[PDB]
Structure 1
Amino acid sequence: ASSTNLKDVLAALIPKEQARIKTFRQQHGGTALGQITVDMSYGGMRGMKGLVYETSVLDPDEGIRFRGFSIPECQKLLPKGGGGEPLPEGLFWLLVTGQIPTGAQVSWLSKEWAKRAALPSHVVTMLDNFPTNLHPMSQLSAAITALNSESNFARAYAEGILRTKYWEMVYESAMDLIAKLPCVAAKIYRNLYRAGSSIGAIDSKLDWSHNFTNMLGYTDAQFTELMRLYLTIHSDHEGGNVSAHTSHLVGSALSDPYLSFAAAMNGLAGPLHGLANQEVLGWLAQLQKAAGADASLRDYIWNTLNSGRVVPGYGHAVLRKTDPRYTCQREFALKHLPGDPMFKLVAQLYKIVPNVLLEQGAAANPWPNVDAHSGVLLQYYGMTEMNYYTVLFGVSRALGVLAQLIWSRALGFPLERPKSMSTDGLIAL
């Protein structure tokens, strides 16, 4: 009998996986997977296999995979709006279950995130009172922190539930949080950039992305398509990235899903991390202030480098080739905004940057990453408020960090608490 329910599927899923991880461990737990070097320790774990994260795997050459699903593969397999871009709802199912969803499942998440989208009074209040010089990421993070009041996992814990049921309450709070996100994010956008106006109502008949754009107040049918792709591609990037790892580290201590997410966001707000979104546009913005020749394009790049600054949008800790997330974006401008002068610049930089970075001989990866291409796309659509970009990243990333978080707790992952050493202590070792 009956219909669609993710929680029920997971219930079926958990015990098998649990069983699966036990025997593997019983046999291989002692297996050395790697070594740790001094350089590794001073180098921010660069190269260190430190975590188990199941939702996605980053390949140094090919890049990110969702099951073992590449972006191009997701693009063709994931249910769409009616209607060329993959629905983030579907990416979510996929990340959660390892399986490709049916349009039917896809519709369930949509309704689900629609029914659940509700902002408590104390949150609206705070956001309403936030100064305008308060960065959108800051506002975003305080808000999510402030929502913790509402944690089903926090309450259940306080009640004394057995550890075995953790995942259950994590799941509820993950679904609620995902659902509330576009409301919080839009409210900040409305406050800061459209003072006096209102977010409106969520309509149970639309997909999440669509209700989001409606809340942001964008009408362009192509903008909606942008959104769906954007929120899908930004989902998840394995576990080692600052935002995902922070949520993983914080969640490990038993802090509810709200608290872990907001810390994840303080992470994404960093310039070398998500903020590159924004830094890229302000660097272009500045570029243009100072139709240029490659030679002047190259002088500009050197001065950045020479000034002990980074060239935003290039480089990666794990990727060693152009980010397929970059290509994905380029192919979208190519279809939709090929004559855009910002676009062209971005295309022009592609030709120069890497070569200049190779020339400098410092960057291990001279290729662009996802952040080099995102904003260009947004600006075209009339969303030119650059200090807001990372919020968009923010909302998407939730899909991936909450998908895994529920697994961690399902699998009983323990407290993340490695050993640290001092230089003296290492000198002595």
Structure 2
Amino acid sequence: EPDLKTALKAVIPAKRELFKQVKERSDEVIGEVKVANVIGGMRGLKSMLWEGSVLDPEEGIRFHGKTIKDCQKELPKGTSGTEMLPEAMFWLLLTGQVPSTNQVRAFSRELAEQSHLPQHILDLIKSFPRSMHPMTQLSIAVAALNTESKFAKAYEKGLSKADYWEPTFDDSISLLAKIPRVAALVFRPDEVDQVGTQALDASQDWSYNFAELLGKGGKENQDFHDLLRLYLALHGDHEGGNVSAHATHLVGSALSDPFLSYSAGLLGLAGPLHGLAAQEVLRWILAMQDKIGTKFTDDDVRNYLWDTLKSGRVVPGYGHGVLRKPDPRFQALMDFAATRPDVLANPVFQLVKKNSEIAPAVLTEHGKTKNPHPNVDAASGVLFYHYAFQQPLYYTVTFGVSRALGPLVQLIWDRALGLPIERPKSINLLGLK
């Protein structure tokens, strides 16, 4: 059966024809720009192209029209376990098609084989102080991988616009292969020489191998391997509007290669209002457990919610900029938890769950939070914590692994369609008067 590159090569003509048709309608009006859009971070403004996913305010995120549940049903699984593979999600995002299981196996083999790192990346990582925030470490080491960029070199030689997409593809695959190893090196700074050169099991999936590099390989960790697969698939893409996806696209649009461009995305993911949300939730939950105890009641949880809000604080992991109904990424994680009795017996999980049953009504009554349903960040941290990954500073590093998926797909499409530099116009306050 076709490999990924071949499969992408077969859908490129249909995408280019679709693009030509849309371009023939260039003069068509689709929206207004208001003052609110200028001062409000472009919120509500339909102004960028993004092929792979469309975030529906009522249904949540869809991937070529498929729900999360559709993807959990249709996408190939690992050689063992129950959860859909992130490599299969990548295939679907890129091509618009669901790969066969043996297509995904040949693709997982590519990701295991291209995972090795040049020596200088080991040296760079070993120079980091141990107190350097893990997302800073991750962003820096991805950027540094630009020494290996095929796009950057091919471009420097003279490269036709028609040939841009293929080196972009080769670099994207290279990045995906290497990023879990860079992530594990962030986690395991005393073992950089071992973990940074360890050969990966050639028949295991991307997430399994990631877990092995984290020191969480083997039979004993098989539920965690499924969590990881699900988590990485769920977080791979969420439209083009989010800061990490947009930053990748923006930097990429200047023809910076995928290593540089996704490094910009990771720097945006390091933001407290973007990728660090999950870490903040776990901290807030643990401080709540600390005050009210493991034999907490609804009443305890309700008072702590009210005490948080009355002090002028936010309840993290609730509300969204676009979403209007409960986040189907949150629900898919809650559904994973529902069938693991040991997760359900964990009080920190019980606390997350009870909080998800009470918080939405408290927040509505308090009245300052837009659509106060749980988002994915409400739950992800506590599930990692359960599996003895009790170092919340590193949860965002896993988000960084996942989130390479969707934005790299769109970079490939950007270069294949020949999209120009992203260049809005700016204005001052005095100009708006």
TM-score (norm 2): 0.95
Structure 1 contact 87–229 (Cα < 8 Å) conserved = yes
**Equivalent of 2:78, from 67, 81, 94?**
81
1:48 matched to 2:45: yes
How do 1:205-244 and structure 2 match up within 5 A?
Answer: 205-218=203-216, 219=218, 220-244=221-245
1:277 matched to 2:275: no
Q: CA deviation at 1:255?
A: 0.6
Distance 1:96 1:367 in 2: 30
Match of 1:315 in 2: 319
Deviations 1:46-75 (A, max 9, x none): 111011100101000100111111100000
2:266 is aligned with what amino acid?
A: M
SS at 1:8 equivalent:
helix
Aligned residues: 423
**Equivalent of 2:298, from 286, 294, 298?**
294
SS at 1:64 equivalent:
strand
Structure 2 contact 289–348 (Cα < 8 Å) conserved = no
Name stretches of at least 5 consecutive residues in structure 1 with no aligned partner. Answer: none
Name stretches of at least 5 consecutive residues in structure 2 with no aligned partner. Answer: none
1:393 is aligned with what amino acid?
A: F
Distance 1:175 1:239 in 2: 20
How do 1:338-349 and structure 2 match up within 5 A?
Answer: 338-349=344-355
Distance 1:133 1:286 in 2: 22
Match of 1:394 in 2: 400
Structure 2 contact 185–192 (Cα < 8 Å) conserved = no
1:53 is aligned with what amino acid?
A: W
Structure 1 contact 116–180 (Cα < 8 Å) conserved = yes
Match of 2:103 in 1: 105
**Equivalent of 2:422, from 401, 416, 419?**
416
1:263 matched to 2:267: no
Distance 2:2 2:397 in 1: 31
1:167 matched to 2:168: no
Match of 1:132 in 2: 130
Match of 1:406 in 2: 412
Distance 1:368 1:384 in 2: 22
Q: CA deviation at 1:195?
A: 8.4
Distance 1:299 1:9 in 2: 55
Match of 1:251 in 2: 252
1:90 is aligned with what amino acid?
A: A
Q: CA deviation at 1:310?
A: 2.4
Structure 1 contact 4–108 (Cα < 8 Å) conserved = no
1:32 matched to 2:29: yes
Please, what is the CA RMSD of the aligned residues?
1.5
Q: CA deviation at 1:196?
A: 9.1
**Equivalent of 1:69, from 66, 73, 82?**
66
Q: 1:14 to 1:270 in 2, by over 3 A?
A: same
Instruction: Among all aligned residue pairs of Structure 1 and Structure 2, give the percentage whose two residues are the same amino acid.
Output: 51
Deviations 1:238-272 (A, max 9, x none): 11011111111111111110011011011111111
Structure 2 contact 33–45 (Cα < 8 Å) conserved = yes
Q: CA deviation at 1:120?
A: 0.9
Q: CA deviation at 1:303?
A: 3.5
Q: CA deviation at 1:16?
A: 2.3
SS at 1:373 equivalent:
helix
Q: 1:229 to 1:132 in 2, by over 3 A?
A: same
1:426 is aligned with what amino acid?
A: L
Distance 2:48 2:234 in 1: 22
Match of 2:91 in 1: 93
Q: CA deviation at 1:12?
A: 2.4
Distance 1:345 1:79 in 2: 33
Q: CA deviation at 1:197?
A: 6.5
Match of 1:367 in 2: 373
Distance 1:186 1:205 in 2: 20
How do 1:140-219 and structure 2 match up within 5 A?
Answer: 140-191=138-189, 198=195, 200-218=198-216, 219=218
**Equivalent of 1:353, from 334, 338, 359?**
359
Structure 2 contact 112–202 (Cα < 8 Å) conserved = yes
Q: CA deviation at 1:293?
A: 3.0
Match of 1:332 in 2: 336
Distance 2:312 2:141 in 1: 34
Structure 1 contact 190–197 (Cα < 8 Å) conserved = no
**Equivalent of 2:391, from 373, 385, 407?**
385
SS at 1:289 equivalent:
helix
Q: 1:196 to 1:178 in 2, by over 3 A?
A: closer
Distance 1:209 1:260 in 2: 23
TM-score (norm 1): 0.95
Distance 1:381 1:158 in 2: 46
2:39 is aligned with what amino acid?
A: Y
